[PDB]
Amino acid sequence: PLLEYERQLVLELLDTDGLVVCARGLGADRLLYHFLQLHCHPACLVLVLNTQPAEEEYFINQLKIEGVEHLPRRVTNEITSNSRYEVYTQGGVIFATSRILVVDFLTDRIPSDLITGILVYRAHRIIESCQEAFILRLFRQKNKRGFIKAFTDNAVAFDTGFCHVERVMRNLFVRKLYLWPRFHVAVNSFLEQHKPEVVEIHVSMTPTMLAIQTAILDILNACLKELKCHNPSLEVEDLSLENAIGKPFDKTIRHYLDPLWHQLGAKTKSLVQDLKILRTLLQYLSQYDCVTFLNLLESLRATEKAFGQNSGWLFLDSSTSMFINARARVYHLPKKELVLESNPKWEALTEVLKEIEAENKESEALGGPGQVLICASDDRTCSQLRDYITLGAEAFLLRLYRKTFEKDSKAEEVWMKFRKEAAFGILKEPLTIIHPLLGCSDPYALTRVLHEVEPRYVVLYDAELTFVRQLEIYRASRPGKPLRVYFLIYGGSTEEQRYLTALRKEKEAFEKLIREKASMVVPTQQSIVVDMREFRSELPSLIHRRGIDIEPVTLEVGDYILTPEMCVERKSISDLIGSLNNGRLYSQCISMSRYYKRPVLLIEFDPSKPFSLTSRGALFQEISSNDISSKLTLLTLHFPRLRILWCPSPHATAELFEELKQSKPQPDAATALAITESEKYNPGPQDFLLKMPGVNAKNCRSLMHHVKNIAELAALSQDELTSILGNAANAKQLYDFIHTSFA
């Protein structure tokens, strides 16, 4: 079916290959499905890179619905390596993960000359994920004939100053860029002839709910300013107060702090924890009821007393205002004259549902009754909405209050008065369906629900840009059937601010992309064994570029094997500090020295921002054991055979690796791999079984056969533990561990 502007886009992409940036929610899955339907042939094989299992299953099922033989097949690590060559020879669309594709391309267990193309969904991941760049470099190194089409929503991902569209565009080997924003003439003119009957209600917050938000925002602003003060390099505009409200703030704070985490300090990590807690406090305030908010507030103070997690801001003069306001929301102490206030959004939802039911009970004869779909943010909100509708405000709030707090009857009845002051068959009646949006996991899940149940009315209890665009596209797909979308938003809150910031960020990102596109218009063999987890970095790509091939295996001893007697552990300054303090590096050195004749430790420092590697304030004090320099000296003193390589960048590390093997023989896999039941004994509960006291290897291995699960493990008494374990002391220790309070 497609559309008009969508078919123009498809024709343009069937022309000279390139990458397509659409507006958030403008049916990128539809374009991917169109290309999959095009390439479901058995005489060709294309690879789709970044897709979720749910999206892949939906695509396969829809293609089966259409009546297509030779459906797409999914290839994952579970399939045996020799069997993976079978599905490649079968042709057709192949859903593959980055890791197995890297392994297959490097080991040449894939007909790289038979690949007719590659489709890169979510092409904005090329910016930071070095695996896909390596896959595309390897593919272009062998085929040079197949196509590369890339699709992406999230035009904001190119708006950050760290990245550049030209670099990622060159990584994809495309050389042509297609921009399809929401204000594009072809799409805007077409979407104006099939617009939905949107009606939005601006629900006003309670004055008590406003004070809580004001206090939380004050605390968040203070913590952000403190974080900026301690990290002058973090003064970037990406950490403004209006950006901390948004969803993707955690990703930016990780990108700016994760590479140098262990050298950050003590207060900075606590400040990041406070930022996360304040953001989840904002979410709880805007989303859930009053009793749940009070529960989270009180539990937050409970752990501060026990450990002191939030001691920085929990005792602030503004924080006490939040506690008092929450208590006034739930309690009233003059004996508890409970208030149990409900947030206004439920009343707006009730009014909307009443109007919808009135319309249905007025116009049954004009077709069917019509179905209503309610979209909420997550599962908790959906459950709360269903309980509120089925029970009522009073019963629901009383149930929550009694379940959590102390159950009272004499005080409860006083509040009630003040508040007042068939087995089988087709339903053939209006149905209300509550659906969790889950925007972060897979935004294109609202489209599947919309196509599964065709709703005459949609209530957007929680709204994001992608869902608005999806509802706009869904209506235009049916030119005759109308729908009315209700847009419930909290007036003058952080939800409205977040939505408006998303709007303006997308618009400015698309304008910047347009300008960037305009400006750019005119322009013997040797091997190294590389650990699998090391491909999330640029070093394996730079090593391969120098002309030496890579054999990727799972290495339990070291990251690189340059020679038969050599082993390199790659540690940055942050990871070196973390491993020295943790104690992992000592065990790694022990194993490497035991197994390899020439163990090597590689440290990658930063010439631009060097780290002192010595404790601050100890420059003039005595030698401190907690210092990193002292720990490094101790380690090199206890391992005289260990050799250390210092490199300033991954580019220099590759050169050193190439030079370090000038005449030595090459290594081989299955020898470093074999350096070091397994199929049984699920890794999940195995570690939990191992870590509690009373079990080293033999007693635990014996006991897990007798006991079906750890669920009933707590049921056994001390004597049964003595009988099963074989000892009474360890059994007593385990029983005391499993049955003890917090004291």
Binding site: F183, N188, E200, R469, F487, I489, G492, Q497, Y499, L503
Partner: peptide, 27 residues
Amino acid sequence: KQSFLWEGSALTGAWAMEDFYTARLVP
């Protein structure tokens, strides 16, 4: 019919800088 959150998504209006901000969110 002043549903400006919806047609504001189309990004086709003038929509000066202050329109992308909420008055109560200044502090």
